[PDB]
Amino acid sequence: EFEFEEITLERGNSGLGFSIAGGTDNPHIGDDPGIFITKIIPGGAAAEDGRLRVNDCILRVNEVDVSEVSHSKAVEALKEAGSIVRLYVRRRRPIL
């Protein structure tokens, strides 16, 4: 049902360049408290790397488990991750 991927980004000055929604305090989809990518910004690290996709659920940020955290905590994890940011993500597998 899902595919998983490790994606490490080099933040640089352009920034990670994606928007997120979700968290235990405000689920973005049903009761799923996941941190979801809602938008990817042209020129940002995510866009240049090419692997991250809209709707991807971020499960881990470097060593921080963000599978079940508040939106605030997800933001803090992303902010403190530094210049080298390892994302472990989950996405829906397409119907074939």
Query: Which one, 28 or 73, has the nearer CB to a copy of itself?
Result: 28
Beta carbons within 8 Å of 60's beta carbon, 6+ residues apart: 66, 67, 86, 87, 88
Smallest gap from Cβ 28 to a copy of itself, in A, equals 6
Q: What is the DSSP letter of 46?
A: H
The yes or no reply on residue 82 touching a copy of itself (CB under 8 A) is: no
The yes or no reply on residue 7 touching a copy of itself (CB under 8 A) is: no
Q: Tell which positions 40-59 bind a copy of itself, by CB under 8 A.
A: 41, 44, 55
